[PDB]
Assembly symmetry: C5
Homo-oligomer: 30 residues x 5
């Protein structure tokens, strides 16, 4: 259960990272 | 079962991160 | 037990990565 | 078994991400 | 056992990724 919880936190941090990269890619395009 | 599902979501987020990064690399490269 | 500990270190490194990325985005945005 | 397989896929994607980032680091200094 | 080994490799690549990102951030901020 504790492994699932740490993995869920890792998942959310990675999603946040992907969102920032998306923003960077837009900035770079313009 | 839940661990596998979270891991697969994590895998898919990283694939997307790699893909955006490939695009960022192309932008900077030319 | 050891799996939880390794996952917890991975979580911490990812938080550091997300933080640096937030700052990079801020630099690029301005 | 499936968990190991997804983790090895995750490892390989991170290796590719690291490589793209090295090239970006190099491009940024000319 | 193999799972622990794979996670420790992932942790190591993430450490490498963080260092590159630190350099990139410094290149951009300067």
């Amino acid at each position: 259960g504790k492994i699932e919880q740490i993995l869920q936190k890792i998942e959310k941090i990675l999603q946040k990272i992907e969102w920032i990269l998306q923003k960077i890619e837009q900035i770079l395009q313009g």
